[PDB]
Every structure is written in structure tokens, then in C-alpha cells.
Design a protein around this ligand. Structure first.
Ligand SMILES: CNS(=O)(=O)CC1CCCCC1
Ligand SMILES: [Zn+2]
Ligand SMILES: [Zn+2]
Length: 582
């Protein structure tokens, strides 16, 4: 308690000595409260006019238009301590999983150099407004690094002064850049060196890309076993126990020198003890602490979520296979059975899973998995939208399985080759493309964001008739040489000025390990769509009068946007589709 977080508390207390009160009508039950001080401020979703003007039929579809308008009583809940058999199952499994992830990887510090390059090409690292404006400025100034150095030597001493969270089913915890560097220096290796790649971790998909996830699910489908299970957890980040955070910290056992001490300090001082500053309307800043739940950078969060999800799902598999009999207590021969299962079949069992952070698909040995719920519930990984002891509903067809907000279609090209393509409800795709985040967008920047969506659609969703047509219209309405942009950057092969047919060929043919024949495609008309009825099922407007008028008059919509942007160089991409090819 206060010995580890006090220094951090004491510091904030002083900087607002003119305000510090122990407010008595404070909400917190599960968060420890420490005091308050005065503040006053709040970023809503702006519409991308370039995409909206070229998607007129969707102006009257509430599922699209409502997306652009507009649970902190789940962050204030508590998770019971797992039983002794559960804690033992997790410790054995975690120990074994780090060893296997570590067999072909070397833990190592990430550097100021690596950190700087990242800031100067815009990843959502999560810093704050103050002393320097943007992160881009602080990185170049030696002052910052002296701040970073003071804290760094403090961490080597087992103490912390400035590593404090800022709160804001979502709750994103920004830290100041300095503390972000210290987290990256010690744990960035997990992402930077691809510890959760499929090749390295067998269950993971880190770095895979949407054009790969469908093929991966189809490979899992080829295994002998039962249904495919894809149970979502209710508020995964809020269900991370202190026992979870202690099995995650066992990565430090693989480390040495400085690194081991620095990683140990991140885990002890910022993860297993946390200090947060929260905005309350009634408006003050609340300085609250707690030991458990997830609160890291979004990138370290992703890797430790994948690790702990891999661990949970191996254990649920162990329960289905009857490797242990009860979570109350493991016997001595049960420990040696668990260790032996891991050594004998652990890698084969990892390969039966696709795990992206809190998101999973498992193809277990058989359907005993569906009612193997005691360890899963006792670890606190409670399933969403199903009663706690009701057996899981599995999927019989890999093409029906939800994973990473998608499902996947099998699509045969007129030449017999097989594409496995990502898909989701088309209203969700159009609704998201019509939205921009943040202020001070020029017409040119708005156009270049619309071009990023259009190029993603040509690469990932070319099989949806409305999206191929709308993608061609947007790429026709935006100047040919203007570069696609995004403000929060998987693979992103659509972010380029290269010809989209050439990028399609590289992604889907040349570099696709599931495609044996490397014959390039010479036009978009060789590239197939879903069946007309399947396209409607997945939200296509084909068949509606609104959509026919839109398609027929598309050059008038393109010309409206060209007139707004002004006399620039434009390409007509509509003749890439047969109906506009005369
Ligand atoms: C490929 N271009 S398209 O989507 O316009 C083709 C038709 C599909 C059947 C209904 C009318 C539109
Ligand atoms: Zn610190
Ligand atoms: Zn679909």
C-alpha cells in the first residue's frame, strides 16, 4: 500500500496544495481514494464529408447515420481470489508458456533511438499535453531525458515518483511520455520482436493481417476435434487478478542485468500498484489507487492479454480432457500430470487456437470443453451473454466463427484458385469510414483519410459489390497522387500510392502461402464477388432503387467532390468495373 504509491501521491498533493481535500461524498468502493484538486475541461466523432457525399444511399440507413452521433460502473467492481488448485494450474502453465515463447527469442531493452523513430511516424503511444506541446518536441529536448533519467535511477532503487495513470466497454489510461518510454524500454521487446507471432507462440496472430486470419481459422478447422468455441469475456481488462499480474511478471525470470531490474520495477510499481487521476463532474481530479485489473500501454496490454488468454484456454482444455479433477486443490501426481500434458501435447494444444488479446477461437479435442467451466469461472474469466454454468454454444463451420470483429468467406476465382476473405456487416464498414476523430482537418486531409478507407476496401472487402464501387468512386474523386493518411495507425498494405491492382496481386497471390499457383491477375474483373444473395445477407443494398440510382449516376457524385476539392489531377477508376467499361 502507501509505501510504494505514497511518493507519487505526496508529489501531486503538493502541486495542488491550494486545493487538496478528502471529499466525503466520493463514489469509489473497490478503488482506494486519497484526495481531490480543481480542474475544468471535456472530443466527439466528426463526419468525413468526402466519404458521405459518395455514399448517399446510406444517408437514410439508421445503423450508418446513428454511428456518428453521441461502463465506468464495471471499472468499479471486484474479482475474488482464485482457489489453490486454480493458482497452482496457472503458475505451472505460465512458467511453461514463458519458457516456450523464450526458446527462440532473447529478451532485450528497447532504446531511446527506437522510441524516437516511433514518435516521428505516429503510433498511439499515449502521452499528455504540460511542458512540451506534442510528443514530437519532447523527444528532441535533452531536458525530458534528464526527467526520464531521474525516474529510471529511482526505479533501479525500487521507488517511483512520476508514473501515474489518467482515466478516460472502454477506459484508456494515458501516462506522460517519460513513463511510456520506461514501459517501452523494459517490455517493448514483446511487440518489437514479435513474441506473439503465430510462428513463435502457435496460438497468436500478432502481425498477421486481415487477409491472413481467415486462412488461419481454416487451418485450425482441419484438426480432428469438436466444435469451434469463441466465447468472449465480459470486460477482460477488469477481470485481470493480482495472480494473473504475478504470472505475467515471471517473464523477468528470462532476463538479466539492468533489464531484469527495470522490468521488475515496471511490474511491481506501475502494474501491481497503480495511481490514477480521474475527472468527476460534481469538477475535481480524484487520485485513486488499486493493485489489480489491466492498466498498461495498449501495446503491452495486447501482448500480456494474449499470454494470459493463451494460459486460461490451455487450462480450460486441460479441464475438458480431465487432466485434473478439481480446482479446490491439485494433488502431487496431478501437478506431474499437468506438467506432463504440457510437455507431451502443449504445443499441439496451442496450435488448436487463434488468440488476439482478449479474443479467442479454440478447436478442442472434443465437446467436453463446452461444459468445462470451473477453472475458467474461478480465474474470473466469466463469459459474456450466457449464464455462468450454461455450456458454451460452439460453431460447426469455420466460416460462421466470429474473430476480431469479422467472419470469413471461402471464395473461388473464375480460374479455380481459392481466396479466404474477411467480412462484416456492411453498415459497420460504411458507418466507420464516414467518421473522423479530432479537429483542424483541411479538405485535403479529409480527402486523404477517405482514400485510406477506399484502398482498405479494395484490398480486404473487394468481394462486396457496394464497397468495390464506392472505393472506385472515392479513388476517382481524390487527386491520384495525394497520399492516404490516418491519425491512429496488423499490416496496413493499403497505406501507399502504388496501383491497388499491384498491391492486391502481391497480398493475395505472390506473398500468400496458401496460394500455390502464382499467376498474377491482370484486371479487377478477374477478381470475384460473394454470391448476390450472400452479399445482401452481409448488408449489401443491391436490389434497392436508391442503390441503382447511385450506381448509374456515380460520375455526377464523383464530379460534385472534384468540384469542391478543385482543379487537381484525377484518374477515372470506374472502368475497372464491367458496367462502366462502356
Ligand atoms: C458489379 N456491379 S454491380 O454491383 O452494380 C452488379 C449488379 C448486381 C445485381 C443487382 C444490380 C447490380
Ligand atoms: Zn516510475
Ligand atoms: Zn460476410
Amino acid at each position: 500500500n502507501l509505501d510504494i504509491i505514497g511518493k507519487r501521491i505526496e508529489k501531486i498533493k503538493q502541486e495542488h496544495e491550494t486545493s487538496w481535500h478528502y471529499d466525503q461524498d466520493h463514489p469509489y468502493k473497490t478503488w482506494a481514494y486519497h484526495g481531490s484538486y480543481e480542474t475544468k475541461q471535456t472530443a466527439s466523432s466528426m463526419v468525413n464529408g468526402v466519404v458521405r457525399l459518395l455514399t448517399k444511399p446510406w444517408d437514410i440507413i439508421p445503423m450508418v447515420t446513428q454511428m456518428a452521433m453521441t461502463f465506468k460502473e464495471k471499472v468499479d467492481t471486484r474479482t475474488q481470489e482464485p482457489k489453490e488448485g486454480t493458482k497452482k494450474l496457472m503458475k505451472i502453465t505460465a512458467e511453461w508458456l514463458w519458457k516456450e515463447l523464450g526458446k527462440k527469442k532473447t529478451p532485450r531493452m528497447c532504446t531511446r533511438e527506437e522510441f524516437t523513430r516511433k514518435v516521428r511516424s505516429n503510433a498511439a503511444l499515449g502521452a499528455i499535453f504540460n511542458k512540451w506541446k506534442s510528443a514530437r518536441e519532447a523527444v528532441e529536448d535533452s531536458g525530458f531525458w534528464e526527467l526520464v533519467d531521474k525516474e529510471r535511477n529511482l526505479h533501479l532503487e525500487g521507488k517511483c515518483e512520476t508514473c501515474v495513470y489518467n482515466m478516460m466497454s472502454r477506459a484508456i489510461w494515458y501516462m506522460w511520455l517519460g513513463a511510456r518510454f520506461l514501459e517501452f524500454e523494459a517490455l517493448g521487446f514483446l511487440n518489437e520482436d514479435h513474441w506473439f507471432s503465430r510462428e513463435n507462440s502457435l496460438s497468436g496472430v500478432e502481425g498477421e493481417g486481415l487477409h491472413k486470419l481467415g486462412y488461419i481459422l481454416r487451418d485450425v478447422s482441419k484438426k480432428e476435434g469438436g466444435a469451434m468455441y469463441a466465447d468472449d469475456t465480459a470486460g477482460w481488462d477488469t477481470r485481470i487478478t493480482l495472480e494473473d499480474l504475478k504470472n505475467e511478471e515471471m517473464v523477468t525470470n528470462h532476463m538479466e542485468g539492468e533489464h531484469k531490474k527495470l522490468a521488475e520495477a515496471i511490474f511491481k510499481l506501475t502494474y501491481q500498484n497503480k495511481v490514477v487521476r480521474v475527472q468527476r463532474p460534481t469538477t475535481v481530479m480524484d487520485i485513486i489507487s488499486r493493485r489489480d485489473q489491466r492498466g498498461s500501454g495498449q501495446v503491452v496490454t495486447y501482448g500480456l492479454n494474449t499470454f494470459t488468454n493463451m494460459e486460461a484456454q490451455l487450462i480450460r482444455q486441460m479441464e475438458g480432457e480431465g487432466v485434473f479433477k478439481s480446482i479446490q486443490h491439485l494433488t502431487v501426481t496431478e501437478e506431474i500430470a499437468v506438467k506432463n500434458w504440457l510437455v507431451r501435447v502443449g504445443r499441439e494444444r496451442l496450435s488448436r487456437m487463434a488468440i488476439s488479446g482478449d479474443d479467442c477461437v479454440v478447436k478442442p479435442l472434443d465437446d467436453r470443453f463446452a461444459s468445462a467451466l470451473t477453472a475458467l469461472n474461478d480465474m474470473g474469466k466469466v463469459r459474456k451473454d450466457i449464464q455462468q454454468w450454461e455450456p458454451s454454444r460452439g460453431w460447426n463451420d469455420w466460416t460462421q466463427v466470429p474473430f476480431c470483429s469479422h467472419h470469413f468467406h471461402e471464395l473461388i476465382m473464375k480460374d479455380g484458385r481459392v481466396l479466404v476473405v474477411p467480412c462484416r456487416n456492411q453498415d459497420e464498414l460504411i458507418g466507420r469510414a464516414r467518421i473522423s476523430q479530432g479537429a483542424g482537418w483541411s479538405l485535403r486531409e479529409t480527402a486523404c483519410l477517405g482514400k485510406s478507407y477506399a484502398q482498405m476496401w479494395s484490398l480486404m472487402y473487394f468481394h462486396r459489390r457496394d464497397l468495390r464501387l464506392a472505393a472506385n468512386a472515392i479513388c476517382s474523386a481524390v487527386p491520384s497522387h495525394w497520399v492516404p493518411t490516418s491519425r491512429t495507425t496488423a499490416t496496413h498494405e493499403w497505406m501507399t500510392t502504388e496501383d491497388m491492382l499491384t498491391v492486391w496481386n502481391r497480398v493475395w497471390i505472390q506473398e500468400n502461402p496458401w496460394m500455390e499457383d502464382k499467376t498474377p491477375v491482370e484486371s479487377w474483373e478477374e477478381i470475384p464477388y460473394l454470391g448476390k444473395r450472400e452479399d445482401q445477407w452481409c448488408g449489401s443494398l443491391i436490389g434497392l432503387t436508391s442503390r441503382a440510382t447511385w450506381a448509374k449516376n456515380i460520375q455526377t457524385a464523383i464530379n460534385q467532390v472534384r468540384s469542391l476539392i478543385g482543379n487537381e489531377e484525377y484518374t477515372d477508376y470506374m472502368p475497372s468495373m464491367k458496367r462502366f467499361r462502356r
